[PDB]
From Swiss-Prot, chain A:
Subcellular localization, as worded in the UniProt entry: Nucleus; Nucleus, Nucleolus; Nucleus speckle; Endoplasmic reticulum
S-nitrosocysteine: residues carrying this PTM: 7
Family as reported in the entry's similarity comment: Belongs to the DNA repair enzymes AP/ExoA family.
Highest taxon in the source lineage: Eukaryota
Function: Multifunctional protein that plays a central role in the cellular response to oxidative stress. The two major activities of APEX1 are DNA repair and redox regulation of transcriptional factors. Functions as an apurinic/apyrimidinic (AP) endodeoxyribonuclease in the base excision repair (BER) pathway of DNA lesions induced by oxidative and alkylating agents. Initiates repair of AP sites in DNA by catalyzing hydrolytic incision of the phosphodiester backbone immediately adjacent to the damage, generating a single-strand break with 5'-deoxyribose phosphate and 3'-hydroxyl ends.
Residue ranges of coiled coil: none
Note: Extract of mitochondria, but not of nuclei or cytosol, cleaves recombinant APEX1 to generate a mitochondrial APEX1-sized product. The specific activity of the cleaved mitochondrial endodeoxyribonuclease appears to be about 3-fold higher than that of the full-length form.
Modification after translation (UniProt): Phosphorylated. Phosphorylation by kinase PKC or casein kinase CK2 results in enhanced redox activity that stimulates binding of the FOS/JUN AP-1 complex to its cognate binding site. AP-endodeoxyribonuclease activity is not affected by CK2-mediated phosphorylation.
Subunit structure: Monomer. Homodimer; disulfide-linked. Component of the SET complex, composed of at least APEX1, SET, ANP32A, HMGB2, NME1 and TREX1. Associates with the dimer XRCC5/XRCC6 in a DNA-dependent manner. Interacts with SIRT1; the interaction is increased in the context of genotoxic stress. Interacts with HDAC1, HDAC2 and HDAC3; the interactions are not dependent on the APEX1 acetylation status. Interacts with XRCC1; the interaction is induced by SIRT1 and increased with the APEX1 acetylated form.
Organismal lineage: Eukaryota, Metazoa, Chordata, Craniata, Vertebrata
Free-text note on domains in this protein's UniProt record: The N-terminus contains the redox activity while the C-terminus exerts the DNA AP-endodeoxyribonuclease activity; both functions are independent in their actions. An unconventional mitochondrial targeting sequence (MTS) is harbored within the C-terminus, that appears to be masked by the N-terminal sequence containing the nuclear localization signal (NLS), that probably blocks the interaction between the MTS and Tom proteins.
Parent-record interval covered: 59 to 71 of 318
Name the UniProt record assigns to this protein: DNA repair nuclease/redox regulator APEX1
Species annotation: Homo sapiens
Swiss-Prot record, chain B:
Record keywords: Acetylation, Activator, Allergen, Cytoplasm, Disulfide bond, Electron transport, Nucleus, Redox-active center, S-nitrosylation, Secreted, Transcription, Transcription regulation, Transport, Ubl conjugation
Organism name: Homo sapiens (Human)
N6-acetyllysine carried by residues: 3, 39, 94
Name listed for the protein in its UniProt record: Thioredoxin
Annotated positions for site Contributes to redox potential value: 33-34
Length: 13, 105
């Protein structure tokens, strides 16, 4: 479900 | 040249500075390696199309710019012209930038 081509915003940031 | 926007306030000033020139905006996350790693094509193209203005935006340090556009994923490229948005797409595809620029050049 996690694609390296895209960074997920689910990150705490 | 490349222009780094750290706030939406400068984003509006940059759009006004470009005037009628094409303006591409990269919302890549600087903290995300896969996205920052794609910056050479985005940044390198600035000298390839010096007649086009390329902006780099940090969703983490320039989250005010990204929050306004409701970005759902990075890297995301947005095209602006005359202060008007005319295109947007997501995906780590640097060649894609070349086609949209040629399409709006």
């Amino acid at each position: 479900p996690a694609t390296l081509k895209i960074c997920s915003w689910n990150v705490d940031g | 040249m490349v222009k780094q926007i750290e706030s939406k306030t400068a984003f509006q000033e940059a759009l006004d500075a470009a005037g009628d020139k094409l303006v591409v905006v990269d919302f890549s996350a600087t903290w995300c390696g896969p996205a920052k790693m794609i910056k050479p094509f985005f940044h390198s193209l600035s000298e390839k199309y010096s007649n086009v203005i390329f902006l780099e935006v940090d969703v983490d340090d320039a989250q005010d710019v990204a929050s306004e556009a409701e970005v759902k994923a990075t890297p995301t490229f947005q095209f602006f012209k005359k202060g008007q948005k005319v295109g947007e797409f997501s995906g780590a595809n640097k060649e894609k930038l070349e086609a949209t620029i040629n399409e709006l050049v």
